[PDB]
Amino acid sequence: SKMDQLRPVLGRAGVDALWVSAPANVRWLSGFTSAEDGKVLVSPDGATLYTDARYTVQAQEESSLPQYIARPPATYEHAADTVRGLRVGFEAESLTVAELEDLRQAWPNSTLVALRGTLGGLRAVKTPEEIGAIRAAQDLADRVYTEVRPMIRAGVRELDVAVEIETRLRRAGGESAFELIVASGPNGAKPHHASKRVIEDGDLVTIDMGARLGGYNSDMTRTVAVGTPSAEMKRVYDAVLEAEEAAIAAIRPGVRAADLDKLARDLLTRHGLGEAFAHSLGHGVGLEVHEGPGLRGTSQDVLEAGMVITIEPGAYLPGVGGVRIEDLILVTEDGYEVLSHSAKESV
Amino acid sequence: SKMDQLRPVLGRAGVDALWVSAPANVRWLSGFTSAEDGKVLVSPDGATLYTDARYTVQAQEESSLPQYIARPPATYEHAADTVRGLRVGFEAESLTVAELEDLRQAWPNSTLVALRGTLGGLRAVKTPEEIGAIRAAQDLADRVYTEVRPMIRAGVRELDVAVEIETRLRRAGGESAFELIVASGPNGAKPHHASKRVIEDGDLVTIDMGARLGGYNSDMTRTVAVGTPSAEMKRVYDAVLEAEEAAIAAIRPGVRAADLDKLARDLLTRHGLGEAFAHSLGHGVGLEVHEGPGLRGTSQDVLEAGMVITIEPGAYLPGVGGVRIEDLILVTEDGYEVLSHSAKESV
Ligand code: NA
Ligand code: NA
C-alpha cells in the first residue's frame, strides 16, 4: 500500500510519473540494497527498477518491482517510451544538474517537473517490517553502548571510546550510523565529534551514536558523569533530562511536532537555559539517520502512529560544557514506545 | 598558482566566474576542512569562501580566501552583486537541481552555465604540500597493513581482518578511506567487500584498503596466499603481478593513460587472462579516493609530474577466485616513485 498511496501523491503534485534517484527512496520503493546503483520509474503503467547486469541475481532476489537490466543511458532511454507526453517529476534535492540534462535529452516529448520532498511523508510512517529492523539496529546500539560505557573514566581519550564502539558495531555485522560523537568537558559545548582529548575527573561526557544494521538506522544520545560534576553542570544535566522526558511523554498521534519543540524550549527557559538549546528537538529515523518528520518550532508536521523519531533537547555553555540526551521513540496508536533502552544515569 | 591557472581555465570554458559547490573543490581552493558547509565563488573580482558563523574561527585559521560569513541564501544573494551581467559556471555533476533553482532566483541578471569536470585537470597535479599529505596517509596505511597481515590465516573471518585494519587506522587519528575489501577464495572473483566468510587453507585473500589522514587519501591492494593455492590461482597471481609491475615501469611524464591500459591488457591476454580483467587500470588519488586522471582504454589523459595514481590490474575467475594488486604512484620529472611500500609476496 506504500505504492498504492504514491500515485495519488504524484497526482496531488501535478505529475504523472516520478523518476526516483535518491538511494534511500530507490531502496524504500523496491527493496534493492545497492540502491546507489539503481533507479526507479513510477509511471501510469507500473513501477520499474533499473540496474545493471552485475546486479542481476541480487535484484531478482531483493526487488519487489520488475527489473530492466542495463547501464545508463540505456535505462532512461528505454524508459522514454513509457513517459512520452507525460509530466515526469524528479527529485530536485537529489538529482544533479548533469543528470537532469541527461534525462532532458532522453525525454524530449516529456515535461520534466522539479519536485521537493515528494516521498518524505510516505517514508515517515514505517511498516511493521521496518520497525522490526529499526528495533534490531537500536538493540545492537544499546548492547554495544552498555558494554563500552564502563570504559568511560578519567584518563581515557574521547577517540578511544569511539573506536571501541565502532569496533564492536562492525564486528557484530553492523556499522556506526554516523560520525560518532564523544564530547567531554568543554567539548560538550561545541556544535561541531570524538577528539584525542583526555577525559578529566569532574567532566560530563556526551556519547551520540547509532547503529546501521540491515539498511536501517538507530540513534540515541547519553551523557554521563566522570566523578562529581560542578553544581552548574549538574543543573544543566538535570534540566536537559527533565526536558527530554517531558517532551517524550507528550508524543501521541495528532500532536504537532512544533508543539513538542515548544514544550522543551519553555521547560529549558524555566530552568534558566532558554538561550542555550538547539533549534530542532528531533527528527525521523529510518533508511537515513535524519529524515522526516522534523521537530522545529516552525514545523508543520503532525505525528502519527508508525513514525520513529528522536527527542533530543540540549543545553550548551560555551567554554564550559554541555549536555544532550536523546531517545528513539516509536509513535503508537495511543501513545509512544521508547525503543532506546540504555540507562540514563544521574550525575 | 593553482588559482592563477583557474581563471584562464574558466575563460577557455566560456565563463567569467565559477560557483564551486563540490566539497573537495571547496577545500582544494580554500583550505577549509569542513567544506561540505562552505562554497566558493571565483569571479573577475577575486575568490571568496562562504560559510556560516559556526565556522568563524576555523575559517579564519584555515582559509586562504577572504570569508563572507552567513547562512544560505544570504551567501549567494550577497554574491549576486559580484556576478551581475556575467556568465557564471557551476559544477553540473555536483550541484542539485534544487540548488540551481536557488541560484537562478538569486542571480536573475546572470547567465548560469552548466560545466563538467572544470577543476579536474587542475586537481590532478599535486603541490609539494599535497604530496606530503598523501605520503603520510599511505605511510599510515602501510604501517597498519604490515601490522595486521600476520593475522590473515585459515579460520579467520574476512570481516575480522577489516575490523582490525579500521580499528588501527582510527586509533591513529585517521580513518579507512573507503569500504574495506577483504575477499578470500571465490569472493576474490566478485565485482561487489569484507564478509563473514572464513578464510580457508588454499585461498588467496585480496586486501583493498586506504587511509584518509589530514583530508588526503591513499590506496593500495595486496593479495596473499593462505597455504598453497591451486596451480591455476598461482598463475593468475603471477600474471597480475607481472602486469602491475610492467605498467608501473612505463609511467613517466607524457605517457598516455590509455597506453598504460593497453600495456596491461596485452600482457594479461598473453598470459591467457585476456577476458578476465577490469576495464580501468587505475585512477588519480588525492582529496578523493577516485579522481583524475583515468586509466581506461578510451582515456585522453596524459600523465605529468606531480600526479598521483593507482595501477591495479586484476583478473577474476567467477566461482573460483581472483587477484588484484595495486600500488600508489607519484609521477616524477623523469619517471615515477612508488609510494605504497607494503610487501608484495609470492604465492
Ligand atoms: Na543521537
Ligand atoms: Na586499492
Side-chain angles (χ1 to χ4, degrees), chain B residues 15-70 72-79:
Chain B
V15 306
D16 306 295
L18 180 68
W19 184 249
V20 183
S21 57
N25 285 329
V26 171
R27 181 164 188 157
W28 182 79
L29 279 174
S30 68
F32 185 52
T33 65
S34 301
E36 64 277 7
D37 290 339
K39 305 288 177 284
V40 176
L41 176 67
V42 179
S43 81
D45 293 330
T48 301
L49 174 69
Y50 298 85
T51 189
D52 69 85
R54 293 170 300 167
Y55 293 104
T56 298
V57 172
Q58 178 178 340
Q60 197 281 325
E61 290 173 345
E62 290 179 338
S63 179
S64 69
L65 312 181
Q67 300 105 65
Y68 180 77
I69 298 301
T75 48
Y76 42 82
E77 291 282 8
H78 173 72

Side-chain angles (χ1 to χ4, degrees), chain A residues 92 95 97-98 166-167 170-171, chain B residues 92 95 97-98 160 166-167 170:
Chain A
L95 196 76
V97 176
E166 286 158 15
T167 297
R170 190 93 159 93
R171 201 179 296 288
Chain B
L95 196 76
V97 176
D160 288 328
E166 286 158 15
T167 297
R170 190 93 159 93

Side-chain angles (χ1 to χ4, degrees), chain A residues 44-66:
Chain A
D45 293 330
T48 301
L49 174 69
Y50 298 85
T51 189
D52 69 85
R54 293 170 300 167
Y55 293 104
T56 298
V57 172
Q58 178 178 340
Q60 197 281 325
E61 290 173 345
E62 290 179 338
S63 179
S64 69
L65 312 181

Side-chain angles (χ1 to χ4, degrees), chain A residues 37 52 54-55 58 90 92-102 114 116 157 159-160 162-164 166-167 170-173 179-180 191-192 194 196, chain B residues 37 52 54-55 58 90 92-102 114 116 157 159-160 162-164 166-167 170-173 179-180 191-192 194 196:
Chain A
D37 290 339
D52 69 85
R54 293 170 300 167
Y55 293 104
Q58 178 178 340
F90 62 86
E93 304 189 331
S94 152
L95 196 76
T96 64
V97 176
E99 286 153 2
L100 173 67
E101 283 175 328
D102 293 342
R116 304 188 186 204
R157 304 192 302 166
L159 177 54
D160 288 328
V163 167
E164 194 58 32
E166 286 158 15
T167 297
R170 190 93 159 93
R171 201 179 296 288
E179 182 178 0
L180 262 157
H192 329 301
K196 298 177 185 180
Chain B
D37 290 339
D52 69 85
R54 293 170 300 167
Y55 293 104
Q58 178 178 340
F90 62 86
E93 304 189 331
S94 152
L95 196 76
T96 64
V97 176
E99 286 153 2
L100 173 67
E101 283 175 328
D102 293 342
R116 304 188 186 204
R157 304 192 302 166
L159 177 54
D160 288 328
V163 167
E164 194 58 32
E166 286 158 15
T167 297
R170 190 93 159 93
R171 201 179 296 288
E179 182 178 0
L180 262 157
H192 329 301
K196 298 177 185 180

Side-chain angles (χ1 to χ4, degrees), chain B residues 178 208-209 219-221 312 324 326:
Chain B
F178 55 83
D208 177 4
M209 60 174 281
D219 195 3
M220 74 181 151
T221 306
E312 181 170 31
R324 296 153 54 208
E326 173 196 76

